[PDB]
Amino acid sequence: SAASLWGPYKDIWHKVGLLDKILKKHKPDFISLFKNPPKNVQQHEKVQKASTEGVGTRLLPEQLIKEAFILSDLFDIGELAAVELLLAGEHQQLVAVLLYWDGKRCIANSLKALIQSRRPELASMTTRFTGLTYKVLTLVSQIDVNNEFEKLQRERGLGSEKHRKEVSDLIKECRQSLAESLFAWACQSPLGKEDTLLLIGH
Numbered sequence: 733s734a735a736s737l738w739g740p741y742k743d744i745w746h747k748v749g750l751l752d753k754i755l756k757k758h759k760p761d762f763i764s765l766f767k768n769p770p771k772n773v774q775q776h777e778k779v780q781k782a783s784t785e786g787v788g789t790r791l792l793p794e795q796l797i798k799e800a801f802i803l804s805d806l807f808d809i810g811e812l813a814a815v816e817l818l819l820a821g822e823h824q825q826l827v828a829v830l831l832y833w834d835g836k837r838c839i840a841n842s843l844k845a846l847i848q849s850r851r852p853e854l855a856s857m858t859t860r861f862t863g864l865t866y867k868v869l870t871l872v873s874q875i876d877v878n879n880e881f882e883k884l885q886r887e888r889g890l891g892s893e894k895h896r897k898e899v900s901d902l903i904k905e906c907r908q909s910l911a912e913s914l915f916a917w918a919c920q921s922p923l924g925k926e927d928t929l930l931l932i933g934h
Contacts, residue, residue: 733787734761737820738831741838764871769810779811799826833902840909847916
């Protein structure tokens with residue numbers, strides 16, 4: 733499972749820039765994606781009960797439930813994960829949206845830092861499962877999905893530009909950081925002809 737908090741990611745990055753092997757060790761988070769949990773129906777009943785449990789459990793008031801549903805509908809995301817996100821970040825509104833993006837931003841930056849900066853046990857650790865390399869292409873996809881546009885179309889007659897500029901911004905940054913990771917991989921060459929062909933196609 734992946735910790736769905738921004739904080740461990742933020743602190744770890746701060747260590748670099750100290751690197752503690754322990755925190756870094758629970759590495760799989762640097763998947764860069766949220767492929768496994770998308771919005772789930774099964775999770776909605778769980779949340780609706782007002783009792784929610786993560787992979788302790790906590791009571792859920794109505795106000796929180798609304799923020800949580802806003803997240804899942806807004807970004808096709810699992811309802812419980814969405815809650816972990818609200819919990820981690822100070823509850824103010826929505827904050828949950830922030831943690832969602834900050835968590836991703838940090839992960840990407842760290843991967844970028846490692847792949848580019850170090851020349852190494854850790855880089856070997858990160859790449860070794862690869863796996864990051866499998867994921868890099870998918871990560872550029874996904875940012876691609878134009879759910880935002882669909883929302884925009886539905887919105888017409890009503891209009892929430894600002895919330896969108898905010899998301900479009902986080903994504904562009906993600907693409908940009910994604911660029912650095914790919915480049916870094918090339919400098920730290922992965923093996924053969926297949927990747928190039930795949931990328932050329934993508």
